[PDB]
């Protein structure tokens, strides 16, 4: 019961930018906030599970499945091995997240995925990122998300299709207090608490040639491919 997969944004280009920005919030002061929420999920019930995924560039390693002193010393040594194409990939990590939930749901459970996104969104994976949301919506898997600086437009649609929460933190070093407040309770205890409501949804699409975010465009009538301001003929078939 209550399996919680955390997908951390381990983008080594954005985290190195803040490591020299002297903003007093590095990666090592953020993975330990995942480790405390990882440890605090293993206390609210006896039979609770955990899985942490790290989103590198061109790689996405599982962290925790390779008492809590053997559950935190693995995530410490794996960040020490993974952190030693200038945009991160997120849909490859949520694809492994839906694969791990589906296997652990075969050995029995309500599950949910918490994404801690840090860098800006990559619109080049919108055709794949939207597939893993409907694959998660058909199994009632919540996709919660907390963002650090910039509102990811793709990630707000993940929390409203599935039914999760979207929360923009205003402060970097108070990350753990938001994580323990709105993402620590499960789906059933969420109905009995007050959470901040979603404030905005970023509904756009992408062209099939430029993949730009369009608000007014042209769709085909048989292919349903949305296009930019040309509309000569159906390009696909």
- Cα–Cα distance list, 95 to 45, 194, 235 (Å): 27, 31, 29
Tell me which of 19, 83, 87, 96 binds other proteins, using CB under 8 A: 96
Closer to other proteins by CB, 20 or 237: give it: 237
If binding is defined by CB under 8 A, does position 77 make contact with other proteins? Answer: no
Tell me which of 58, 70, 84, 86 binds other proteins, using CB under 8 A: 58
Under 8 Å between Cβ of 35 and 72: yes
Distance CA 174, CA 2 (A): 25
If binding is defined by CB under 8 A, does position 227 make contact with other proteins? Answer: yes
If binding is defined by CB under 8 A, does position 118 make contact with other proteins? Answer: no
Task: Indicate which of other proteins, Zn ion, none lies near residue 224 (CB less than 5 to 8 Å, by partner kind).
Answer: other proteins
- Reduced to 3 states (helix: H, G, I; strand: E, B; else coil), residue 89 is coil
If binding is defined by CB under 5 A, does position 17 make contact with Zn ion? Answer: no
For other proteins (CB under 8 A), the number of binding residues is 75
Of residues 167-196, those binding other proteins (CB under 8 A): 176-177, 180-181, 184-185, 189, 191-194
If binding is defined by CB under 8 A, does position 82 make contact with other proteins? Answer: no
Instruction: Find where tokens 């491919």 sit.
Output: 225
Beta-carbon contacts of residue 204 (< 8 Å; ≥ 6 apart): 153, 213, 214, 215
Of residues 188-207, those binding Zn ion (CB under 5 A): 207
Of 213, 54, 58, nearest in space to 121 by CA: 213
Under 8 Å between Cβ of 166 and 155: yes
If binding is defined by CB under 5 A, does position 1 make contact with Zn ion? Answer: no
Tell me which of 19, 26, 36, 74 binds other proteins, using CB under 8 A: 36
Tell me which of 36, 95, 135, 220 binds Zn ion, using CB under 5 A: 220
Closer to other proteins by CB, 23 or 45: give it: 45
Phi, psi of 33 (to 5 degrees): -75, -30
If binding is defined by CB under 5 A, does position 222 make contact with Zn ion? Answer: yes
If binding is defined by CB under 8 A, does position 109 make contact with other proteins? Answer: no
Stretch in the footprint of Zn ion (CB under 5 A) among 10-18, 116-124, 171-179, 224-232: 224-232
Find the Cα–Cα–Cα–Cα dihedral 160, 162, 167, 168, rounded to 10°: -70
Instruction: Find where tokens 């997969």 sit.
Output: 5
């Amino acid at each position: 019961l209550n399996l919680l997969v955390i997908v951390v944004d381990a983008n080594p280009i954005w985290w190195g930018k803040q490591a020299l920005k002297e903003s007093q919030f590095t990666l090592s002061k953020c993975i330990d906030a995942v480790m405390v929420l990882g440890n605090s999920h293993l206390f609210m019930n006896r039979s609770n599970k955990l899985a942490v995924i790290a989103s590198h560039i061109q790689e996405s390693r599982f962290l925790y499945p390779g008492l809590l002193t053997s559950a935190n010393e693995v995530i410490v040594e794996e960040i020490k091995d993974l952190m030693t194409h200038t945009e991160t990939l997120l849909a490859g990590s949520l694809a492994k997240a839906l694969c791990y939930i589906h296997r652990m749901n075969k050995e029995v459970m309500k599950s949910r995925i918490l994404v801690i996104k840090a860098a800006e969104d990559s619109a080049l994976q919108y055709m794949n990122f939207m597939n893993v949301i409907f694959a998660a919506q058909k199994q009632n898997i919540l996709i919660d998300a907390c963002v650090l600086d910039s509102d990811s437009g793709l990630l707000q649609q993940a929390c409203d299709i599935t039914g999760g929460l979207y929360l923009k933190v205003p402060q970097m070093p108070s990350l753990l207090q938001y994580l323990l407040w709105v993402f620590l309770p499960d789906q059933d205890q969420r109905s009995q608490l007050i959470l901040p409501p979603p404030v905005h949804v970023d509904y756009r699409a992408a062209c099939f040639c430029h993949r730009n975010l369009i608000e007014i465009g042209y769709v085909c009538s048989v292919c349903l491919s949305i296009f930019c301001n040309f509309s000569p003929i159906c390009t696909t078939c």
